[PDB]
Amino acid sequence: NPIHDRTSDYHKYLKVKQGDSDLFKLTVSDKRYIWYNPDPKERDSYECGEIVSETSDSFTFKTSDGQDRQVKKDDANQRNPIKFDGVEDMSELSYLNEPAVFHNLRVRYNQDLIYTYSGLFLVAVNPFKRIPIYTQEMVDIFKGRRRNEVAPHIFAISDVAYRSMLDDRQNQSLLITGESGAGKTENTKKVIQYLASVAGRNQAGVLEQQILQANPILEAFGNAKTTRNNNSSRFGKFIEIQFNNAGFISGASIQSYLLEKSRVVFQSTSERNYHIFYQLLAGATAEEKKALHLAGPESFNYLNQSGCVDIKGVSDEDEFKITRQAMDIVGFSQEEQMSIFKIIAGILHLGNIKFEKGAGEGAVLKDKTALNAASTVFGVNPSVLEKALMEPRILAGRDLVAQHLNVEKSSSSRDALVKALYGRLFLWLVKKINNVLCSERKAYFIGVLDISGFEIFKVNSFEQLCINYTNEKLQQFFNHHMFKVEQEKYLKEKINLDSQATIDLIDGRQPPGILALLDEQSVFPNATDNTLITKLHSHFSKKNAKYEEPRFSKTEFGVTHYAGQVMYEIQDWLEKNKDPLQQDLELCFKDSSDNVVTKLFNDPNIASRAFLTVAAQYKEQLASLMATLETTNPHFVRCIIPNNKQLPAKLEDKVVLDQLRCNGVLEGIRITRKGFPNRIIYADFVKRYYDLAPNVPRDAEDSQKATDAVLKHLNIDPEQFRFGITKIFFRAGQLARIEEARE
């Protein structure tokens, strides 16, 4: 039992190291500390100041420099007793303030303990280095173990979900959120690995293997190197791991959301386009290249712009193999693989099209190589394509007349074509995989949601509003959940909004919210960003409290979200809402000779939305997701990025705290701390504090009696504590004081 084996990797990597003695006595000290900001120029940077004296109303402490300051007792961030340093659950801290919470996390992270509970949450800080805690051997130890029986780990929460599912006969969910680069995807993969192991059909698993192999496929197509993460997920996902009544994996399903189609045509400097582009061009056999008109990334417009074509310590060609390998396992026919790659090629081809002017104002294609190349790979007719691009037929009422688009318009059209192809292929890939894995007859499921938390960037656009909208919903679901769960707990022992307004501002029907207004402007071909933003301010500036019209910007607006105010820019929202593609182009592609291509334009389930707008579909999909969640027993993982540089051993208070503020961890604690944060099992209490009362012995039968003895001895303030059927409930700071009590 590595759990009992203080020499195991289990103890080494998941636990705070334990010495010989446990004796209350060791941890003894006269000093009493406080956390203070070594200056409010900061606020997240704190220092430990020893309290040198106090008044009936405040404290006076010394600083690091030796400077003596004073603080209101009522404003003081008391430091928890050293014994509390490193606890596995922040719910165990007596003093539940910000700096204190950060401090526990940091003490843990300093020992490479990246997982910590906070009440209902599992907090996970990216180590930005390898920690060998995800082995089969580590898998093995979390089997059937209670949360309180093993160290914090993603495996642990995974096991608890699996057990609850079987014991309660209730579906489960794991919501894994946080910023880009926080560790969501990695943690998601671990949940699945874990489940695959505890519930897979042993012997050697085919379905299991296919389930495992779907990720890789999806990541090649939906993941890219960004400035925040080398393997950034540019789509959100909800994976449903399906089980039969026996608790064995019976299948799975994947739901994808918000794929960043725009990255296909444009990438910021240092970033890359989707991985597959590089995989194909590196891994294609000199023979497939020829057949694909493939060259180097530098030869491609869509890949030669960012300046970055490789990922440190990443072999595209080696990855291509892995990719093709997975497609094989899942079950992509060579023929299908061919066409997917052809689509990939084609898109690269479309990007190399260079529209020219002169003649007049309308665009011309002096050179058609690229065109020819895309047409071939795609299996469409070049001339048709050609005209569909520059001379699309447009409906002027009764009139359907071809228009001669200029360069920019021609260019944008081409871009829209590429984005549609890519999004549709991605959707097709998903469905293909679901076909393989998905079971119409499942008994139970454990769903994992891997999606960004709130996004507050330099520039916030429509996709940002979407994600933040989802986030308000998940936060509200958390709050509701925390509410019942806390109530139930109090009930089993015998004890004691705002999200709506924001949600309504965005998704309301009457009065209409942001999305309803957006949709409305959507029917008007001539509407503009200016008409839209004016309408939004018209309805909400000084009229809706969660809304703010900027002092000078004419193109932005602010929303007061759970995580704070977010300023959104309205440019192109109209276009984004419609996601238009010229009919001619649809017509062109519908006639493709390619087996896969045909599906993308011919299968309405793929080729279309319903038509509803992008906003309406987003809202709908979010509502279905929440509906599903509502039916589950949920578990929450908050992934935290330690800094903005992708470095290990560098936990930045400011970076971290901001995350704790936005993600609900601190709020949760604020709330918790208001009641009876500390809840201790009778025997546990006595075991540690028996010696504080001339009366009680370590292991006593009447533990509750024994508890009251110490308390009584100590003469603790009654309203400071609460006798529960099996635990002693303590208000904030109580236990710390007691800890502070002489033997």
Ligand X SMILES: CNc1ccccc1C(=O)O[C@H]1C[C@H](n2cnc3c(N)ncnc32)O[C@@H]1COP(=O)(O)OP(=O)(O)O
Number of residues that bind ligand X (CB under 6 A): 21
Query: In the annotation, is 397 catalytic?
Result: no
Binding part of the chain for Mg ion, among 78-86, 226-234, 412-420, 605-613 by CB under 5 A, reads: 226-234
CB of 184 to ligand X, least distance (A): 3
Query: Site residues for Mg ion, window 242-261 (CB under 5 A)?
Result: none
Q: Is omega for the bond preceding 511 within 30 degrees of 0, making it cis?
A: yes
By CB under 6 A, residue 655 contacts ligand X: no
Q: How many residues bind ligand BEF (CB under 6 A)?
A: 8
Q: Catalytic pick from 91, 185, 188, 678?
A: 185
**Residue 236 falls in the annotated catalytic set:** no
Should residue 649 be labelled a site residue for ligand X when binding is judged by CB under 6 A? no
Interface stretch with ligand BEF, choices 85-93, 229-237, 667-675, 714-722 (CB under 6 A)? 229-237
Closest to ligand X by CB, 641 vs 700, is 641
CB 378 within 8 A of CB 343: yes
Number of H helices, E strands in the chain: 27, 22
Distance CA 350, CA 352 (A): 5
Q: How far apart are CA 606 and CA 590, in angstroms?
A: 12
Helices 369-378, 382-390: inter-axial angle, 10-degree rounding: 120
513: left (phi over 0), alpha (psi -120 to 50) or beta: beta
182 is in an annotated binding site: yes
Residues 457-516 that bind ligand BEF (CB under 6 A): none
Residue among 184, 309, 308, 191 at smallest CA distance from 241:
191
Rounded to whole angstroms, the Cα distance separating 297 from 317 reads: 13
Cα gap 343→280, rounded to integer Å: 11
Binding site partner of 126, from Mg ion, ligand X, ligand BEF, none, Cβ cut-off 5-8 A by kind: ligand X
Query: Is 732 a known ligand-binding residue?
Result: no
* Residue closest to 146 by CA, chosen among 681, 730, 668: 681
Which residue among 181, 351, 724, 733 is the active-site one?
A: 181
Annotation marks residue 369 as catalytic: no
Does position 213 interact with ligand BEF (CB under 6 A)? The reply is no
> Which residue in the set 181, 392, 447, 513 belongs to the binding site for ligand BEF (CB under 6 A)?
181
Task: Clarify whether 455 is annotated catalytic.
Answer: yes
Scored b (16 or more CB within 10 A) or e, 144-153 reads: ebebeebbbb
Q: Name which of 185 and 460 has its Cβ closer to ligand X.
A: 185
Residue placing its CB nearer to ligand X in the complex, 348 or 640: 640
Residue nearest to ligand X (CB): 183
Binding ligand BEF by CB under 6 A: which of 172, 180, 375, 413? 180
Using alpha carbons, select from 655, 673, 490 the residue that is nearest to residue 100.
673
Q: Which of 34, 90, 150, 182 binds ligand X (CB under 6 A)?
A: 182
Q: In the set 23, 26, 131, 545, which binds ligand X (CB under 6 A)?
A: 131
- Of the candidates 329, 79, 353, 326, the residue with the CA atom closest to the CA atom of residue 220: 326
Residue from 80, 94, 116, 233 touching Mg ion (CB under 5 A): that is 233
Site string (597-636) toward ligand X, x via CB under 6 A: ----------------------------------------
CB 698 within 8 A of CB 40: no
**Residue closer to ligand X (CB basis): 311 or 364:** 311
Interface residues for Mg ion in 180-199 (CB under 5 A)?
184-185
Of 143-151, 226-234, 551-559, 603-611: span binding ligand BEF (CB under 6 A): 226-234
Of residues 326-345, which lie at the interface with ligand BEF (CB under 6 A)?
Answer: none
User: Pick from 184, 263, 679, 722: which binds ligand BEF (CB under 6 A)?
Assistant: 184
The answer to whether 184 is a known ligand-binding residue is yes
- Interacting residues of 463 by C-beta distance below 8 A, sequence separation 6+: 258, 260, 576
164 is catalytic: no
Tokens of 31: 């000093």
Amino acid at 67: Q
- Antiparallel, parallel or unpaired: β 393-395 and 400-402: antiparallel
Catalytic one of 386, 455, 548, 739:
455
Q: Which stretch binds Mg ion (CB under 5 A): 120-128, 230-238, 452-460, 679-687?
A: 230-238
Find the part of the chain contacting ligand X (CB under 6 A) among 125-133, 475-483, 494-502, 666-674. 125-133
**Which of 97, 230, 232, 256 touches ligand BEF by CB under 6 A?**
232
Instruction: Give 321's Cβ-side CA count (13 Å radius).
Output: 4
The whole-angstrom separation of Cα 329 and Cα 331 is 5
Instruction: Answer yes or no whether residue 452 interacts with ligand BEF by CB under 6 A.
Output: yes
Residue 166: CB minimum distance to Mg ion, A = 29
Structure tokens, 294: 């493939």
Q: Is 177 in the site for ligand BEF (CB under 6 A)?
A: no
List 80, 126, 177, 229, catalytic entry: 229
Q: By the 8 A CB rule, do 187 and 178 touch?
A: no
Catalytic residue among 453, 513, 664, 733: 453
Classify strands 77-78 and 68-72 as parallel, antiparallel or unpaired. Answer: unpaired
Instruction: State yes or no: is 60 an active-site residue.
Output: no
Instruction: Decide: is 508 part of the binding site for ligand X (CB under 6 A).
Output: no
Non-local CB neighbours of 675 within 8 Å, separated by 6+ positions = 486, 496, 731
Our answer to whether residue 232 is catalytic in this structure is: yes
Q: What is the DSSP string of 11-62?
A: HHHHS----S---GGGG--S--EEEE-S-TT-SS--EEEEEEEE-SSEEEEE
Residue 183 assigned as binding residue:
yes
Q: Which helix (H) or strand (E) holds 709?
A: helix 703-714
Residue 525 has φ and ψ, to the nearest 5°, of -50, -35
Closest CB to ligand BEF among 228 and 539? 228
Residues 644 to 703 in contact with ligand BEF, rule: CB under 6 A: none
724 binds ligand X (CB under 6 A): no
Q: What is the C-alpha separation between 721 and 176, in angstroms, rounded?
A: 35
The residue from 80, 94, 215, 233 that contacts ligand BEF (CB under 6 A) is: 233
C-beta closer to ligand X: residue 278 or 547: 278
Query: Is the Cα torsion angle 58, 90, 664, 130 positive or negative in sign?
Result: positive
**158 tagged catalytic:** no
Q: Which residues are annotated as a binding site for ATP?
A: 178-185
Q: Which residue ranges make up the site for Mg ion (CB under 5 A)?
A: 184-185, 233
Q: Which residue ranges make up the site for ligand BEF (CB under 6 A)?
A: 180-181, 184-185, 229, 232-233, 452
Active site residues: 180-181, 185, 229, 232-233, 453, 455
Q: Which residue ranges make up the site for ligand X (CB under 6 A)?
A: 114, 126-127, 130-131, 178, 180-186, 229-233, 311, 314, 639
